[PDB]
Design a protein around this nucleic acid. Sequence first.
RNA 1: UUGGCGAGAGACCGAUAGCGAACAAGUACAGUGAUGGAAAGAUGAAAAGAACUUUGAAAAGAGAGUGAAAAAGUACGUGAA
RNA 2: GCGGUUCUGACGUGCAAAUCGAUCGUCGAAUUUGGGUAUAGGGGCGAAAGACUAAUCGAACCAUCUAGUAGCUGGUUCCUG
RNA 3: AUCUUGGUGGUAGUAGCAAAUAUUCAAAUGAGAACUUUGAAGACUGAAGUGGGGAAAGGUUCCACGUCAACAGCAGUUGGA
RNA 4: UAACCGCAGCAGGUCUCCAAGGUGAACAGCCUCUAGUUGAUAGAAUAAUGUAGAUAAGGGAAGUCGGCAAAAUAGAUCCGU
Lengths: 386, 63, 106, 174
Amino acid sequence: SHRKYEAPRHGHLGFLPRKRAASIRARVKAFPKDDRSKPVALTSFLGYKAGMTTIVRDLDRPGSKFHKREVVEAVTVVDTPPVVVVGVVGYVETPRGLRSLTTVWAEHLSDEVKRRFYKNWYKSKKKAFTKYSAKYAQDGAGIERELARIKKYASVVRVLVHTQIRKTPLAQKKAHLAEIQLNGGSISEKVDWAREHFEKTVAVDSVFEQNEMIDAIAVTKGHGFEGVTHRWGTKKLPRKTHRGLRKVACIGAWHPAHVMWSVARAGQRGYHSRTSINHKIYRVGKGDDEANGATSFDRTKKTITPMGGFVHYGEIKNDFIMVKGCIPGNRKRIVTLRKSLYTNTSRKALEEVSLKWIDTASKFGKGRFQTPAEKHAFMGTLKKDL
Amino acid sequence: ANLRTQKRLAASVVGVGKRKVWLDPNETSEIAQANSRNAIRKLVKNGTIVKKAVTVHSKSRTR
Amino acid sequence: KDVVTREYTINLHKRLHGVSFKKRAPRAVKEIKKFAKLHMGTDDVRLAPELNQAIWKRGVKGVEYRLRLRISRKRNEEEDAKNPLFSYVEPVLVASAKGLQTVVVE
Amino acid sequence: ARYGATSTNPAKSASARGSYLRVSFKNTRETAQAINGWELTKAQKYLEQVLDHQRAIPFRRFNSSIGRTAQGKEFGVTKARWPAKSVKFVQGLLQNAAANAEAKGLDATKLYVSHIQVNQAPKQRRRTYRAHGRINKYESSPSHIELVVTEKEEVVRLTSRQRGRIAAQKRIAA
RNA sequence: UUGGCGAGAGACCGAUAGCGAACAAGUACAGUGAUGGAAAGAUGAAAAGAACUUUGAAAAGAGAGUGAAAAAGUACGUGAA
RNA sequence: GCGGUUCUGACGUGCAAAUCGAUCGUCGAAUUUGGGUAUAGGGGCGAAAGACUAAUCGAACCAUCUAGUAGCUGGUUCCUG
RNA sequence: AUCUUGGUGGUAGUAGCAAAUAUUCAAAUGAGAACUUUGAAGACUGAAGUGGGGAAAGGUUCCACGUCAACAGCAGUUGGA
RNA sequence: UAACCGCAGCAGGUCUCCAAGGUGAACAGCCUCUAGUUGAUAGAAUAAUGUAGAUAAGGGAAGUCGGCAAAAUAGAUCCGU
Ligand SMILES: [K+]
Ligand SMILES: [K+]
Ligand SMILES: [K+]
Ligand SMILES: [K+]
Ligand SMILES: [K+]
Ligand SMILES: [K+]
Ligand SMILES: [K+]
Ligand SMILES: [K+]
Ligand SMILES: [K+]
Ligand SMILES: [K+]
Ligand SMILES: [Mg+2]
Ligand SMILES: [Mg+2]
Ligand SMILES: [Mg+2]
Ligand SMILES: [Mg+2]
Ligand SMILES: [Mg+2]
Ligand SMILES: [Mg+2]
Ligand SMILES: [Mg+2]
Ligand SMILES: [Mg+2]
Ligand SMILES: [Mg+2]
Ligand SMILES: [Mg+2]
Ligand SMILES: [Mg+2]
Ligand SMILES: [Mg+2]
Ligand SMILES: [Mg+2]
Ligand SMILES: [Mg+2]
Ligand SMILES: [Mg+2]
Ligand SMILES: [Mg+2]
Ligand SMILES: [Mg+2]
Ligand SMILES: [Mg+2]
Ligand SMILES: [Mg+2]
Ligand SMILES: [Mg+2]
Ligand SMILES: [Mg+2]
Ligand SMILES: [Mg+2]
Ligand SMILES: [Mg+2]
Ligand SMILES: [Mg+2]
Ligand SMILES: [Mg+2]
Ligand SMILES: [Mg+2]
Ligand SMILES: [Mg+2]
Ligand SMILES: [Mg+2]
Ligand SMILES: [Mg+2]
Ligand SMILES: [Mg+2]
Ligand SMILES: [Mg+2]
Ligand SMILES: [Mg+2]
Ligand SMILES: [Mg+2]
Ligand SMILES: [Mg+2]
Ligand SMILES: [Mg+2]
Ligand SMILES: [Mg+2]
């Protein structure tokens, strides 16, 4: 008989199966539509989630009760040192979908990248690309022919880049390698661009700008095997329930005589791939800048690193991206930032953002001071200082 | 060795509980030979077996 | 690998973080054995009874945060044991375990 | 005497057996299969490593609802274990067989385990007490084990028509 | 004349049969008690029941031996499923 | 100490053929209890529930009459013609 | 024949061996020590006791020497074996 | 909580004597001395679901057959009933 009262189902059947993602680096599954009039450019970039902090700015939203008033907003800082370009892949359209025709690699790969081709680096003889590099000997006609292939046949071109994980505070030495699609220009212009950046770096300021909406693609924080109550949000059963109460009481009718795929069950929670869209960029930070935590209103020379370091992360000595709100993944996780797939023309999307103040107190407790100097002024002299 | 008997007899001869007899761990061979209450009596005389002191319960704080 | 003696501080606080109370002092014993194996490479670790007293001084859940230990790698002279060397761990009678570096002893 | 089916030369073989051993049959069968066919020195080292939890015995038949382990990977399995009581009994038998081979004067460097076989011995019966005044069996499942180490060592009918063809063929080739 | 004693027999049963009981059986064991009440035969002609050697802490193994046979080793004829 | 209300808690192939925990009733008498002693099966005993009478009660247990009767259920053993 | 007696599987190396706060270090013994003995330490019963005696009941369980096949649902050199 | 009964070395049951210090009304609970014990398969890890024990912003029985469970109250002195 019909369920006595209606309610929406628990959870979304578009995110099944709730399983452990296949890699720790989430795949970009769609790149922006290519406009071949524009100059050649990366459509995405790699970074590492540092942490979150807090911002003040004035709101420019006519008609809002908070128009021209200060709001405080959470932000996420992604540590984005420059990516090195180390190769090109040409894809060709087929009636079975895109297929990679050939890859060409740079002559010289760093040990950051070479490490990605080994499970036991320390014991290896380190032979990766040793015969390949010798293709570049003579003029290197072998490379020239493979590039000519790409120019002749390819319908889309992607560059292989790697992170410079050495520049981060992370314990890992093995860089992450990823294909990023080149938009803009002809196929020939794209493969030239790629050729003229082999071994060169690409800086986040080339890709992103202040106020641009971007998408964050990352594997979500893991939580291991989870019960139905927290994994799906089902209602806890009454206190009088024999045999436990964090459960679904009825897992099906008698017919179909099968448990249906749509019923909530216990299993893996977290470590899923996710693509969150429309995160506005509030700051593209320079690493060299000693005042990258300062603003026009707050002229205090300071970096974005909060007192104590970002908890479980470290300093931020590199270029960075500051994005409104939160993104998938935990501190230290590789993250792919992607250009918007569409042209948003909301008033929310078009707002030009100017930060009054960036919080930089310690996140390892109830931090009261923005800088060491601020602390020393308020406290005065202590016994250790003497 | 198994001195379980020696500890029982020592308690009886010294007139204290088994929890207060101390059997010298360096003199296990000699103690193992003490089958009789006489034998145990000699061992107590030459300090191979000793009566441990009572654990103190002071009445100092009470007073 | 030679005969050596060194004095070490073990941080027991960080190693017993979160351990069940009835298992703190027993776990401290195993943690000291593991630490001797790290530093001396010897599977056979012997703890002096006096060290055992030091670990258990404040009962089963009152293990000191830092202990100073003298660890002596010594030649095993017993028939034909599996390991030719063993470590002996003994306490260092000191006021405070704080502020000390590893040092060698002659 | 009288072992299971064997196919080796008895002159180049030594044998050992143990009967009514109070050790799990299901565990020893798996242990025995783990070394069947191995060079004898290799089998001894491996059995030492199993006692040290460095390598495992793969459990191929009697393995329902055991646990999974990375030490299974060298043998292609997920389910492996370290049955110490089985391992000890089997090492006693390999020691006995090696000695027996030395006494016959076989070459210890070329010995391999050519036959190993564990059989179920008669059960040993205790009882367990269950709810509501019931009694059930609580039996041991002992083993017979036996092994043998061995030195390694390294008209045409044709119809008249076919005959005629063969002749014609050679008359042309020449 | 289904008891007792002494005899002779059988187209009877052949160790889950025949008396409950071929055997230290009205036994062991159960029950407060009246009562209830089993299982359990077969090395070989003869113990000739394996000296001695070797591996093992030992049980045992491997040899050697006894025997017509250990494809008879007392966990003993045959030895099914 | 004696009891056994509620959780309709634990357990529910148990620690247990009635237990465990918490909560609870009573706690100087129509009180609790050891031993001795009396009452025995259409009988006893019952501040009464058909309760209790050796894990047995709207008629105990044991043996015998007894292989009790069954218009009812189940089974009923080789081949071919 | 939910047949009778006996034997044997799959289930399965699975359920499980989680109440009563708690163990640790060294030496000895020994083929072998989480479990034996001694010593050191840490704890508990907390005198309406896990202490010291008895009644019913048991019947040698007491004590020593030897000693581990079985039994003490892990072990065992220990034991009410 | 292993000598008795309960199929057993079973968290059950089974009559009684002796009885220290502190806190406190107290043979309550908690801590200790004399005496006794340190038994009860262990090691590693710390998912879900449990069992036992807890805490919770704002609201305060809207939950449910039903305030079931839990919380709140709590000793003593004075007042006031
Ligand atoms: K319904
Ligand atoms: K399993
Ligand atoms: K009979
Ligand atoms: K025969
Ligand atoms: K009548
Ligand atoms: K009766
Ligand atoms: K009658
Ligand atoms: K009829
Ligand atoms: K009885
Ligand atoms: K209500
Ligand atoms: Mg409806
Ligand atoms: Mg949520
Ligand atoms: Mg219920
Ligand atoms: Mg924080
Ligand atoms: Mg914790
Ligand atoms: Mg399965
Ligand atoms: Mg049971
Ligand atoms: Mg019973
Ligand atoms: Mg008969
Ligand atoms: Mg014959
Ligand atoms: Mg036979
Ligand atoms: Mg068959
Ligand atoms: Mg109760
Ligand atoms: Mg209930
Ligand atoms: Mg259950
Ligand atoms: Mg009625
Ligand atoms: Mg009839
Ligand atoms: Mg009848
Ligand atoms: Mg299990
Ligand atoms: Mg249980
Ligand atoms: Mg123990
Ligand atoms: Mg207590
Ligand atoms: Mg106490
Ligand atoms: Mg005795
Ligand atoms: Mg046992
Ligand atoms: Mg045993
Ligand atoms: Mg009994
Ligand atoms: Mg009992
Ligand atoms: Mg007083
Ligand atoms: Mg316990
Ligand atoms: Mg609340
Ligand atoms: Mg509140
Ligand atoms: Mg209120
Ligand atoms: Mg209501
Ligand atoms: Mg309602
Ligand atoms: Mg209530």
